[PDB]
Amino acid sequence: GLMQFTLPVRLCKEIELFHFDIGPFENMWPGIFVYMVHRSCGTSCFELEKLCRFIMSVKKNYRRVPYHNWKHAVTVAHCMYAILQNNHTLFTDLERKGLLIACLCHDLDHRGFSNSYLQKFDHPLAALYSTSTMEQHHFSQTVSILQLEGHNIFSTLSSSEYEQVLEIIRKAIIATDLALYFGNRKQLEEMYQTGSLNLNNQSHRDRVIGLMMTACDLCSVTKLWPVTKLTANDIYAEFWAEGDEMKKLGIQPIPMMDRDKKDEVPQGQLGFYNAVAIPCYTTLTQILPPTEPLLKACRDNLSQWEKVIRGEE
């Protein structure tokens, strides 16, 4: 019970910052997550025995893919930690329990292919789940690991509280489907502008939670330029793999997934920062002002991509 996780001085300080990078030491990632849970939620939220077992079954069910891997899981969970920590009084007990677990679990058993390629390949999962294919699968994988004997980290919640947290985790994971974000953020932009936004309205909380999930999921664009740049290599490694497989289906992929069209990548990132990232963190900073550091980091990285195109790097 009195067993606290303590990090080295540089991590203990840097971890509280939005732009924290969890480092190349995989065996430190569990303790970093448990440390974030203990300070976000409490030393009591979970039986340390069951959480540790949970964490390690979750790790085992991520694959060895260039981007959608165990590192991505802990990285997305860390972004949520900083949002939660900078917004102490806005989220309930069950939300702070749910959302970190939601983030660690959000890409379980990812193969490195989009919902598009699953449908064109005619993968079994595309017949099981017609929309948000991989995200319904990710949520299914979370339930199954929660159901392994000794793994139920919520065991100590009432029937209602348990369904409340599963519900938060399900919507949280489904919201990571980027196809759903555009309408989520538009709706949120309207509600905030017309003043109709109300955090006592569950429908409204759901939408704000969805946007937080998108913000955390995309958080590689809110790191320092060297992390953002080296992570982009992992992202495009998956995209080029998927384009290769599209070509094997006899379909010419979109230039973003064509490894012949690598020159178009810098311009590819401008479109993405302007179309997806900046809007996402703009509305987030409007609804939760203390998350402004993410928009600032995103704007700087937009500048760094501009400077790449202009041949300055």
Ligand X SMILES: CCCCOc1cnc(N)nc1OCC
Q: Which is nearer to Mg ion, 19 or 110 (CB)?
A: 110
Question: Is 269 annotated in some ligand binding site?
Answer: yes
Q: Report CA 135 to chain centroid distance, whole Å.
A: 12
Question: Is 300 annotated in some ligand binding site?
Answer: no
Residue 141 touches which of Zn ion, ligand X, Mg ion, none (Cβ within 5-8 Å per kind): none
Asked if 172 is part of the footprint of ligand X (rule: CB under 6 A), the reply reads no
Question: Is 252 annotated in some ligand binding site?
Answer: no
Q: Which is nearer to Zn ion, 76 or 197 (CB)?
A: 76
Q: Which is nearer to Mg ion, 176 or 214 (CB)?
A: 176
Tell me 40's DSSP state. Answer: H
- The token duo for 278 is 């900046």
Q: Which is nearer to Mg ion, 132 or 304 (CB)?
A: 132
Of 19-27, 150-158, 163-171, 213-221, the window that binds ligand X (rule: CB under 6 A) is 213-221
Question: Is 193 annotated in some ligand binding site?
Answer: no
Please work out the total of residues on this chain that contact ligand X, with binding judged by CB under 6 A: 11
Please work out the total of residues on this chain that contact Mg ion, with binding judged by CB under 5 A: 2
Q: Report CA 176 to chain centroid distance, whole Å.
A: 7
- Choice among 19, 38, 68, 151 that is catalytic: 68
Tell me 61's DSSP state. Answer: T
Q: Which of 15, 209, 218, 295 binds ligand X (CB under 6 A)?
A: 218
Q: Which of 22, 41, 51, 107 binds Zn ion (CB under 5 A)?
A: 107
DSSP string, 146-206: HTSTT--TTTTS-HHHHHHHHHHHHHHHHHT-HHHHHHHHHHHHHHHHTT---TTSHHHHH
Cβ of residue 273: shortest distance to ligand X, in angstroms? 8
Of the candidates 45, 60, 30, the one whose C-alpha atom is nearest the C-alpha of residue 97 is 45
Asked if 176 is part of the footprint of Mg ion (rule: CB under 5 A), the reply reads yes
Asked if 181 is part of the footprint of ligand X (rule: CB under 6 A), the reply reads no
Query: Under a CB-based contact definition with an 8 Å cutoff, are residues 294 and 20 in contact?
Result: no
Q: What is the CA radius of gyration of the chain?
A: 19
CA distance 254 to 252: 7
Query: Under a CB-based contact definition with an 8 Å cutoff, are residues 173 and 139 in contact?
Result: yes
Residue 139's alpha-carbon distances to 4, 146, 278, in angstroms, are 30, 11, 27
Cβ of residue 181: shortest distance to Mg ion, in angstroms? 11
CA distance 246 to 254: 9
Amino acid present at 101: I
- Is 68 catalytic? The answer is yes
Question: Is 244 annotated in some ligand binding site?
Answer: no
Q: Which of 95, 135, 217, 238 binds Zn ion (CB under 5 A)?
A: 217
Q: Which of 138, 268, 288, 297 binds ligand X (CB under 6 A)?
A: 268
CA distance 68 to 234: 9
Cβ of residue 135: shortest distance to Mg ion, in angstroms? 6
Asked if 228 is part of the footprint of Mg ion (rule: CB under 5 A), the reply reads no
Question: Is 177 annotated in some ligand binding site?
Answer: no
Three-state DSSP class for residue 95 = helix
Q: Which is nearer to Mg ion, 87 or 114 (CB)?
A: 114
Asked if 235 is part of the footprint of ligand X (rule: CB under 6 A), the reply reads yes
Query: Under a CB-based contact definition with an 8 Å cutoff, are residues 139 and 169 in contact?
Result: yes
Residues forming the site for Mg ion (CB under 5 A):
107, 176
Residues forming the site for ligand X (CB under 6 A):
114, 178, 218, 220-221, 232, 235, 256, 268-269, 272
Active site positions, annotated: 68
Residues forming the site for Zn ion (CB under 5 A):
107, 217
